[PDB]
Amino acid sequence: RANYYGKYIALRGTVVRVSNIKPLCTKMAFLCAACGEIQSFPLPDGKYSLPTKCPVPVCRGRSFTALRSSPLTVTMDWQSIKIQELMSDDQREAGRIPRTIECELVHDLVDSCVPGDTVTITGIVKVSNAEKCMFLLYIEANSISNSEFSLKDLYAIQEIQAEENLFKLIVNSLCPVIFGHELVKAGLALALFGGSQKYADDKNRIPIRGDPHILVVGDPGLGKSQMLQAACNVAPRGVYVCGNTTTTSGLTVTAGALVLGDQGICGIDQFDKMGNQHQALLEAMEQQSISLAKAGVVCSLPARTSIIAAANPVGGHYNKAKTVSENLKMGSALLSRFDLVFILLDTPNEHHDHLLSEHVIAIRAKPLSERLKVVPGETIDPIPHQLLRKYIGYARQYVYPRLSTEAARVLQDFYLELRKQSQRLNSSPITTRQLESLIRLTEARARLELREEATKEDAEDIVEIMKYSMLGTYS
Amino acid sequence: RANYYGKYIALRGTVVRVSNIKPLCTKMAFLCAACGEIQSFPLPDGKYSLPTKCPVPVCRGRSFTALRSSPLTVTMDWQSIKIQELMSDDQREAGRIPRTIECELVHDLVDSCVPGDTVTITGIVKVSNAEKCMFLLYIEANSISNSEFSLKDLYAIQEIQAEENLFKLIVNSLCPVIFGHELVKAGLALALFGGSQKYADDKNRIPIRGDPHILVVGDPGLGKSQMLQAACNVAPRGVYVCGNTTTTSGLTVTAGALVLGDQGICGIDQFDKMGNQHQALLEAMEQQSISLAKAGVVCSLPARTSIIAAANPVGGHYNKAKTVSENLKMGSALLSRFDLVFILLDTPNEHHDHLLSEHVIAIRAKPLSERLKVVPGETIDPIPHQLLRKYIGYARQYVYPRLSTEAARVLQDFYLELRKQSQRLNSSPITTRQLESLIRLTEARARLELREEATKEDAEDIVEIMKYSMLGTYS
Amino acid sequence: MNSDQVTLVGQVFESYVSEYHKNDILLILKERDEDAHYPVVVNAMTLFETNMEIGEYFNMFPSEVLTIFDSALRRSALTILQSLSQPEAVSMKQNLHARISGLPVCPELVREHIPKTKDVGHFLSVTGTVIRTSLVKVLEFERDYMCNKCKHVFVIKADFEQYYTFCRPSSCPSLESCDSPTRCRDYQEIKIQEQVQRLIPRSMKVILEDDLVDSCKSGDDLTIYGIVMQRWKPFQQDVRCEVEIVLKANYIQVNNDEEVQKEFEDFWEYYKSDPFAGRNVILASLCPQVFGMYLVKLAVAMVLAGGIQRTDATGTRVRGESHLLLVGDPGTGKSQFLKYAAKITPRSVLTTGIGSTSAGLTVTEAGALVLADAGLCCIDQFNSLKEHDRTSIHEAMEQQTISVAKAGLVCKLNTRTTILAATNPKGQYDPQESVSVNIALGSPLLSRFDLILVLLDTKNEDWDRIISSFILENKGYPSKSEKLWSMEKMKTYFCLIRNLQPTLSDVGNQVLLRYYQMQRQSDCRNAARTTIRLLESLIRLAEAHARLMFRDTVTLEDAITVVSVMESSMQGGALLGGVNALHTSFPENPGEQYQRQCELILEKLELQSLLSEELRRLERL
């Protein structure tokens, strides 16, 4: 605020308002009086002054005339950038935007940054004038970098990796309040990590997306609005937006929600109410890019998003004697892109409700469906979410999984019996996207345990979760 | 315009443009030259000047320096008020708004007025500057009052009260051009006066409105568009608005029509054709108040209206063999608010048509239905509308009627046989609103005769009129 | 002022700060940085009562006192540094400041209204909200300009009264006749609007300085202890000079009688033998312009009672409020209850409903739900509430928080409000064809409402006569006994019981659990009122009933009352029977009815081991 005046400091932030370039002069020359000996007075920081005295050999000075044509005058570049600070800490409920400090680049720099970056800037702090003894604060740049975990962070992540059952401690720690619903939480955990991005045939590429997409559909009152909140909370970059106050210009670039949630989670609630913006996201989530919305005149920008949606059947409660397509009000185009669509039912059992009521009154005071549950009589103390947030960041930029020969046979076999059975039966057509989704999810079950392989049980763990929206559920 | 310059006069008007406050200085001090002896020059009317001479003991003056910190400087408040002059007289057809003159409050005043009053102001008339010898006119206030009929007006109202048959003379003088339709004119006359306002249980009150509401429905050509024009003309404050040039933003606050008709009548024509503004006045007429139309962020304003509406059936002429509900296109909510909904028919009689033709060509050259009819061979000379206008104003602010013990029994008995009879048959449901409406209308027939009682005949006269939209008509 | 007066004043403050303020100065000394800023908080009443002379010297020239106290703090810090035993982890700092608080409750110093022109140089205390906020900016204070024609340098300062301008000096204070920027501060600008609750009010332009910058927020209650001064403007020839009133801040607060209590324990100690007599008296005074209708009047009080919020550690939080909705034929008194309940609650907003646009029900600018934080917004004409808007409230009604990213702003706001609703039954109402059929509202929305009370007008020959007599005879409050209750007493009663936090028990929850398990499937389990949200409300209502009777321990009586009320709420299909809400009158004796209700409830649901204990407790009282 005040004390740091003319003191060398360091900063860290993001660039959002890269400006144009206009030259300026610092060593402009002046004319001489009487005899010759042109001089090159050191004009300071682009402020016009006058040489009331000239050293010269002898006699009077004056010589107040400009000579802005001699090669004595030199010119140098200029720019102006503003920096907004990161979330950092101090999660106040107040909606105050972080303070913004301007920056100025002097020479040999410029065109070194683009909108959206993580840069560290070190430079002297100075005070401007004429925004009248009223001024502001700006920083003159001295050095720039481009793009870190502490040693204790490495120790902590190593200790979490040392856990004997890493899968349970992360599948039953995303949200401990909700009782039950283990498979959906497992799917959310799988989607949080992601898979690998294939740049096959580098010369032409045509890159294929390497993250999944998950949709949850079920009866109201089952709690499908907090498992998504917890999932969005534990993420390096996440945004949560309702499906009512947003328009086509809101979701897409008009800076939309999707671009802000780049390399993260952009979970959308109340997906069923949308009836006009459906056809504005297929291209966005398929082509993995979005262009300008003003007549489509190029100007594309990347947008990597992992959309998570939760929806309600059209007729409130979902009846048990009807067809799946009519109870969803969705075409064959927007239903096939999603990898998994869980269907949840609400039935009046006698043991499950008895346990759930006890849990909800206490809070106010083998297949992959039983090995994940917790029997009463032991401690399953969850990892704090603050530590788990810094684990995904390490697991995302230091490990790239690769499929092995052994695991591919199981996926190929599953696809083969899936095709010959979908040939006759009536369901969503089994395209070639199912095999790619299976590959992506098997790659996903190699990044939670911090490994680079694809063993048999890794691929076998994805044929049982797959059988919860597919054949295991169509009946 | 010109002559009344610097001459003490008096005014009378309302206030609409109360503004904020800002202090001003009148005797701020100056610095002294050479020796001390500062002075406190009486600067005039807030115009900066200079002391070209200073009295002092001796020597030269000058001393042109400001010292705006000494306690010699004195300050006082300020304000600005705009006055719009009433209707008064000279009812010119030109739509020129009355001229407005500004006001200025000097000291110890301010916060003595609220938007909307009736104030008398006396003060000096001065001329402003710099709105360049081009100025305007404004008045510096000197005394403010807050809150009248002449002696001749009183003498006239006593003679008007002295008439032997006051009800006939006032019901057959509202509109003499139209022949017949005695009961509708009686209802309009009852509506013009109004009833009493109940402030029971002062600590919480929850006041109840004390004015009726009448709707007229009948075949076209019966003349139901001039009985309302005359009623609007004979009123202390009235307004006439069509049903096609106004929207929801017009009737309600955006100053709507209802606000301008405060303590008066706001009769609306072509009521049936509205199809989108039907659900916009239920709150306004019942709550006896209206709030802001911008997201409903408080800022409520009173709106006391006696809405009178006239409309035609949906299918032009109303056939005689249908059900009443389908011939009005009205729900059970808006049809029950109105106290009286007269239904008129056009049938080809013989004597009535002959008399009507004779009257309409001559113009161009016992139950409570016959005692009011005029037998030819007598003079029923109507009172001028100018005198009748001054009668309602006296009636509505000097008499507060109340119900008597004898009259309440008849109303209770009527309600008891009405409910028990119409609860089984098909008709508009009878709520507790009719009991309050009967009380309101019985109170209404006590301000026309300038009395404060409730005679048995008073309650008996509101039974025959009521049997013209109720049971006496549904058959 | 006299020379000895300031010396004595400084001695008084230094003695007080050395005697009562060692810990804070010790903490201040043991900090990093050398010359940034460091304030000290000092109470006023203690030093006022310590010496009678300081108050008179203070509250007439509130300018030199602050400087004298700053000097006293400086000499105290110097003395402490001199008398220090651990001169290693310490630092001496040249920038100290004063901040007084704890002003008396004199009527002329705690004024709520902005002074007109009479308070110039007086220390005042004002309260209000925040509207506008400026940017952080840096001023220049003092120049120490170059010495011309003489030797000694000049230390001329700036003036606040002239918008921080500098006047050129020409008369040097030099003894002889010879007469001829590394400084920074802080700044801000804030506008304060007077509150309307305790009253259109005008605005106060308060100026902040030094550490007070970046310490206030838009939309919060503030309390500033500042001095009032005037700001001039440069003079122009033959015009009207302009002035303004400002408030230089000196301290800030982020704030947001035993007689009333003693009366309340007297009232709920007199009614010891009969506990339900007090509840009957409480319910009778609610909306006393209407006759009868016991159940609805009890439900309104229960809804207005409230609950407790319970948030989990990491991310989640559950609802702790309640909502009510009423349906019935026109002409039963729905609007009266809403109007009457809109006044008792401290903060409430009244809206039309269909006449309210989307800007109010949601965020645009603040609408209605966000503007009614910790209050109650009444909702009317719910039949056709602009279906888009009618459905765009599911998020904010259940999660108590809005989550919108319109136009790429990503703004999050909090809204905690109990919603009261009343709508007409479009179409002729039928005993069958449950509310989802008559009113045709979606099942997801017809699940978050706690209690849905149905009103029906039927054939009777007694209620009609009674109501006719009530309306005609103008018998206001037929109970002529002078008990009544005033509206202010009810407001205090409902504003005071919101501070208790009841705790659950063991003679309680078992009954609710068994009831929920039984109701989960009897033969039809209705269609939408048998979800998990039923038990989440059966606890919030039973707890709320316990906060209306001055205790913090739920018992069997509260559970029985809440179960009976909510079972009567569910129209049609039930397990005991349905009773019309309108045809209900205050019982002459509540104890016998309570005993009968307990005996009826505790038999078919097998908790007979508690009935003996309950009857033993009832007998011994």
Ligand SMILES: Nc1ncnc2c1ncn2[C@@H]1O[C@H](COP(=O)(O)OP(=O)(O)O)[C@@H](O)[C@H]1O
């Ligand atoms: N298994 C559970 N354990 C605890 N609370 C639950 C559970 N399931 C649902 N709830 C309650 O239900 C609420 C969530 O409602 P939800 O079903 O998400 O609404 P919607 O169907 O509109 O998304 C939460 O407040 C939570 O208290």
Ligand SMILES: Nc1ncnc2c1ncn2[C@@H]1O[C@H](COP(=O)(O)OP(=O)(O)O)[C@@H](O)[C@H]1O
């Ligand atoms: N009883 C009457 N005496 C004289 N003129 C009448 C009478 N009834 C109707 N009229 C004539 O009918 C006209 C009014 O038409 P009206 O019925 O008000 O149209 P609308 O049905 O569209 O309101 C007037 O110009 C008037 O001359």
Ligand SMILES: Nc1ncnc2c1ncn2[C@@H]1O[C@H](COP(=O)(O)OP(=O)(O)O)[C@@H](O)[C@H]1O
């Ligand atoms: N028990 C009662 N005692 C006195 N007046 C009543 C009673 N019940 C209803 N009313 C009258 O009915 C009116 C209530 O109308 P209401 O039914 O709220 O209209 P809406 O159906 O539009 O909500 C009140 O003005 C009141 O005078």
Ligand SMILES: [Mg+2]
């Ligand atoms: Mg949700």
Ligand SMILES: [Mg+2]
């Ligand atoms: Mg007409």
Ligand SMILES: [Mg+2]
């Ligand atoms: Mg109503």
